[PDB]
Design a protein around this ligand. Structure first.
Ligand SMILES: Nc1ncnc2c1ncn2[C@@H]1O[C@H](COP(=O)(O)OP(=O)(O)NP(=O)(O)O)[C@@H](O)[C@H]1O
Ligand SMILES: Nc1ncnc2c1ncn2[C@@H]1O[C@H](COP(=O)(O)OP(=O)(O)NP(=O)(O)O)[C@@H](O)[C@H]1O
Ligand SMILES: C[C@@H](CN1CC(=O)NC(=O)C1)N1CC(=O)NC(=O)C1
Ligand SMILES: [Mg+2]
Ligand SMILES: [Mg+2]
Lengths: 382, 378
């Protein structure tokens, strides 16, 4: 039947039917993932089985909180509470909350608009060059859509009110907001959600997902300047990106060479054991598939090393490198909503990052150089 | 606050933020293969092209190839590129689009599936399908990025012909012209004029024309039992081995290419790479230029065995001497994005397996790859 064969569906129906291009796979995946080990106080690489979409909806909320540091530089604190037994996750940030006002076009409260309707954002005017992670106006709604319960709480000092709004059943139930007088306290936003574990094929939050979620909170402390992050009330202790990269020290002439190149670029280098490795952040987004920023940095290092060597194949140099990058890119573009891979051309970054000769010279003091010299005179022998 | 926060439509968002739908609408400097007509072979060239423009064309091509999955009686695809008039025509035979009013939507079906987002015949995954179409965007994405978009189709069930024109990024939809058709065969024809200025272009230059043309050779290579015509010329690629062999001259510049059909859903070819790892792969006729799980599945098998042989050197040394070609069929595939450049489907969900025979890996151990690896080892 022609009418049965050709189907039209709503955008909301499509998201639930086909999560992949919105939040990534809802099937279990075997992955090698970095985990923060509390018994040894360091990052360890572990074979885990996780559902990427579940990890992603958490990440969407985390990155929104980090984005608030950009809009409000006075923001000091992010709290992440994971209540595994209760299947609830809370992310709270201080600094400016959400305006408690009726939108003069949409005729609803702004928090209801931007957490309860697709395609809503403060990031749609690209005349402003912004270094927020937020771009498309989907993130928070995707979390809501994949939650059985989703609660937004915010306090607005301009009106002196607190606003609490609950959605249920994959954003399909939207309860009216509870608005109360709020005097003589700080602004903040708190997002609480209970992921719809049925849609992720799970019955509980297991040790693998909790492990990667917790590490992602370390990432946030590592990548966002001048904030204090707490996990279930406990300080993560690290204060900057250098401290973050140092958590990898045990698993990795200094082992780690770190440099802030400018106010938008920090780079660290270590020698890799097996092959090319990268850990990179764009506006606090974890770019696990790398992209133009990673290639920009590594190409430079490879080119400069190669030139010193010729005075070997490029993949030979590259694959002895473990690179860490924390960068701020203007109005970035990615291959997908998950933002695993940056596609912004270098000329559109809004900044440059030239790696200085002094840094390259320091790399030439590491095992990387020894390994390349071996390849080199073997190539001469033949 | 009201000005700080905005709600936009799906259609506004696509034009505002094309990247997750069709890829970048900015120029990209790329190494790309093109078919050199004078030498009758593939040549690697530095080009500057806008991926989104290449992609809207690819959406229409793969749709035509999908019609061969749906109707195995289909025999030909015609592509006509009219560079001067920036017009592109893609015609296939076999079953057309049903000229019926939809039960629910109350409009003609072709209007529905070419002129409204989120419309598809691929939404029911109870059926295990080997089409490339998955999400119900591709054809609409082409329409949206066109100044003018024309669907022509004829169905023999009703004995009619249906012609409908959209304009101005799909915003103008003209009523269909439906006429009596007792004439020849069923067919569908899509004619569009890309909104070139939206891609920052004045005209279809030689770079984009070269990759568009190569992509048509790709289709002939990856899809069996069809004739493919480009601007009137029969391409006549016999099979996937013939397609791979188009790369022979540039690679040759112990056979140069080792080809094997593994089974009915998997074909692989191998050549030695001079600079780094290279792959050309297709999943259900989609060009998976960013690879993914199928490429990893094949290369891991090869690298793992060669590693054991050398052990009797790091895995990256082996992999970076490989040029792999893969043509495969995957059930209900999943990708990272609408552009379908990277497959994410797990091997266990493929619908088939591809165990590379040890004698094939033995043939690989006769090439320059082994000589190079043994010099690192010994
Ligand atoms: N913790 C927060 N504090 C302040 N504003 C927030 C917070 N979380 C979300 N927002 C606002 O809500 C809007 C919607 O969030 P979101 O759905 O994630 O879209 P986005 O961040 O703009 N883009 P994207 O994440 O790429 O889909 C954002 O644009 C912010 O303006
Ligand atoms: N040349 C064609 N012949 C027959 N049917 C077609 C043709 N092109 C498109 N269709 C039909 O039109 C629908 C819409 O096409 P399209 O927008 O490209 O979606 P899709 O191919 O199903 N999914 P996707 O391409 O992944 O976004 C398809 O599902 C097909 O049923
Ligand atoms: C790519 C688009 C959604 N996508 C669904 C799909 O399967 N194909 C499309 O073209 C549209 N995306 C949704 C989202 O979460 N964020 C965006 O920016 C647009
Ligand atoms: Mg966001
Ligand atoms: Mg399609």
């Amino acid at each position: 039947s022609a009418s049965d064969k050709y189907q039209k569906i709503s955008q909301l129906e499509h998201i639930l039917k086909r999560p992949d291009t919105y939040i990534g796979s809802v099937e279990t995946q075997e992955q090698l993932q970095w985990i923060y080990d509390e018994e040894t106080d360091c990052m360890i690489e572990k074979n885990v089985t996780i559902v990427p979409g579940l990890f992603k909806i958490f990440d969407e909320i985390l990155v929104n909180a980090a984005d608030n540091k950009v809009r409000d530089p006075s923001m000091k604190r992010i709290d992440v509470n994971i209540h595994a037994e209760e299947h609830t996750i809370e992310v709270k940030n201080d600094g400016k909350g959400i305006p408690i006002e009726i939108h003069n076009k949409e005729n609803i409260y702004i928090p209801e608009m931007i957490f309860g309707h697709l395609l809503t954002s403060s990031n749609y005017d690209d005349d402003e060059k912004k270094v927020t992670g937020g771009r498309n106006g989907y993130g928070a709604k995707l979390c809501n859509i994949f939650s059985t319960e989703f609660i937004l709480e915010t306090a607005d000092l301009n009106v002196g009110q607190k606003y609490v709004q609950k959605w249920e059943n994959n954003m399909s139930i939207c309860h009216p907001p509870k608005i109360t007088s709020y005097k003589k306290g700080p602004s903040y936003t708190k997002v609480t959600f209970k992921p719809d574990l049925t849609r992720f094929g799970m019955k509980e939050l297991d040790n693998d997902i909790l492990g990667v979620m917790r590490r992602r909170v370390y990432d946030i402390n590592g990548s966002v300047r001048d904030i204090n992050v707490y996990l279930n009330g406990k300080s993560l202790k690290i204060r900057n990106f250098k401290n973050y990269v140092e958590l990898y020290l045990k698993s990795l002439i200094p082992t780690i060479l770190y440099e802030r190149i400018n106010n938008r670029w920090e780079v660290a280098f270590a020698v890799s054991d097996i092959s090319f490795q990268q850990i990179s952040f764009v506006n606090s987004i974890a770019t696990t598939m790398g992209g133009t920023h990673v290639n920009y940095i590594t190409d430079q290092i490879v080119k400069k090393i190669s030139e010193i060597l010729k005075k070997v194949k490029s993949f030979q140099i590259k694959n002895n490198m473990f690179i860490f990058i924390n960068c701020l890119i203007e109005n970035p573009a990615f291959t997908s909503q998950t933002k695993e891979q940056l596609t912004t051309r270098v000329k559109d970054f809004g900044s440059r990052c030239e790696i200085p000769l002094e840094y390259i010279n320091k790399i030439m003091k590491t095992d990387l150089a020894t390994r390349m010299f071996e390849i080199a005179d073997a190539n001469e022998e033949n």
